[PDB]
Each structure stands twice: as structure tokens, then as C-alpha cells.
Design a protein around this ligand. Structure first.
Ligand SMILES: O=S(=O)(NCc1ccco1)c1ccccc1F
Ligand SMILES: [Br-]
Ligand SMILES: [Mn+2]
Ligand SMILES: [Mn+2]
Lengths: 137, 137
């Protein structure tokens, strides 16, 4: 039986700027670094950056909607978004759903998000205003 | 600050086969579906499958090393991996370069992994068998 997400691994084209992005800009904790990768944590999340020459710096129009959302409190959301904007981090989408969301790109074009709100909150909102074809289990 | 992974969203090309893969084959909990997506949980992980006409079925030699690992216990690991193998689930990696892991593909080629062990356990193992150039902070 699967018990949760064990780790998220992102392929990166250049290790130093990716470590800087996740550790310094996004505030994650750096636990280890080697010639071809790094391990960081963000709360319970184990993040691995893996240096991969096959990683392309990918414009957002050229990747699908796969994306990785990080939790932040409502109280901290706007100042963290402003930090990303000061650093020149590109946005790939505007929020049109429930719960605050800021959609931003990492140096290689990985699609990231800051989101406020849980699955339970989303399900409650959907129960009140179901999407087209929505079924609950 | 950022406190963990709020959710993982995977773009999928065909919704019902992907829901079946994550719910039936991997055992995750299905909470809701709609015409363009589904919400599942795996322990504390919120997984969203998003129907995306841009998603392509991607062979593993065509994608980089970005991947998603799910936690499984030492007692359950081998029989779960063997069940995926017997079910014909495609693979993408054989060499255990980060501990006890089984590497397999979802229907669209998303790179998945079963892994036994925490970040702390992986750091302890790496102190004895470090990756080249490894430094610990
Ligand atoms: O809309 S459903 O009830 N979704 C639930 C589902 C899909 C895969 C696993 O659970 C459905 C769609 C298509 C075929 C069968 C169905 F049960
Ligand atoms: Br469905
Ligand atoms: Mn999202
Ligand atoms: Mn892994």
C-alpha cells in the first residue's frame, strides 16, 4: 500500500542556479549536494534536484499542464508572490479557481504554484458548485 | 514560508484510463472526477489528474529524469513491484542508485517510482556510500 509522496525529483540543466532558486529564493532547506544533484526539504517534502543534460529550458507554451504546488499560508502569500516578482520570476497562468494561487516557473521551465487551501477545502467548494460532469466518491 | 507540497498535478491524455491506473492499480483513493479531471489522495498527498489535449504519451528515452516517488513499506515493496511487473506496467530504470526503488511508467509515460525509506535514511546511507563529490550540510 502506498502511504504518500516519498520524493519529487526535478531534472535541472544547471545545478548552481537551481540550488539557488530552491534554497535561497524559495527558502527550502539544503541537506546535501553532490556533483550531479542536491537534496532539499520543504516541510515534509523531500525534493531532489538531478543534473540532467537532457533537461531543456522549456517555454511554458511548450509543456503540458503538469505542475507542482507548494503550500503557503494566506497571510504569507502576497509577500512571497512579491518576492518572486522582484526576482523577475515569470508567471505562466493567472488564478481563476478557489484559493489563492500564484503560478510561476523555475529556471528550467518547471511549472510551479503557490497555493492556499487543502483538498478538503477544494472538495467542499466543488460540492457547492460542481464542475461539469462532477461525481463524488 | 513554504511548508510542503500542496498538490501534484499530472496532465493526462485520457482521463478514465489514468484514473483507473492510479485508483485501481496503485490503490490511491478517488475522491471526485469531472469531465476534465480527477482528485485522488495517497496518504497526505493530493493528486490531481488533469485532462490536457497537450499531453503526449512519452517514451522514457524522450523525457528527462523528472519523476515522482511514492512511499511504500519494506514489507510491501517487493510484492507490489512484482504485481506491477506481472500486470505489464512499463519501466524506465533498473539500477538502484538511490536505495530500494522500483521505477515504472504511467499510461502517458510519467516517470513514477516506489521507494522504501525517508530522506533521513537516504542521507545516512549516503554517508557510507556517497554520491561522487557529496557534501552534507
Ligand atoms: O466517471 S466514472 O464513474 N469515474 C470513476 C472511475 C474511473 C476510473 C476509476 O474510477 C467512470 C468513467 C468511465 C468509466 C467508468 C467509470 F466509473
Ligand atoms: Br473518470
Ligand atoms: Mn494547481
Ligand atoms: Mn527517485
Amino acid at each position: 500500500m502506498l502511504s504518500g509522496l516519498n520524493h519529487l525529483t526535478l531534472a535541472v540543466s544547471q545545478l548552481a542556479p537551481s540550488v539557488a532558486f530552491y534554497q535561497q529564493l524559495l527558502g527550502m532547506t539544503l541537506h546535501a549536494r553532490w556533483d550531479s544533484g542536491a537534496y532539499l526539504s520543504c516541510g515534509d517534502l523531500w525534493l531532489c534536484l538531478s543534473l540532467d543534460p537532457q533537461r531543456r529550458v522549456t517555454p511554458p507554451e511548450e509543456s503540458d499542464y503538469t505542475h507542482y504546488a507548494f503550500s503557503i499560508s494566506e497571510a504569507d502569500f502576497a509577500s512571497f508572490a512579491a518576492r518572486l516578482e522582484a526576482a523577475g520570476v515569470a508567471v505562466w497562468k493567472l488564478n481563476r479557481s478557489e484559493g489563492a494561487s500564484h503560478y510561476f516557473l523555475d529556471p528550467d521551465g518547471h511549472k510551479l504554484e503557490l497555493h492556499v487551501g487543502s483538498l478538503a477545502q477544494r472538495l467542499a467548494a466543488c460540492r457547492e458548485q460542481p464542475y461539469k460532469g462532477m461525481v463524488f466518491f
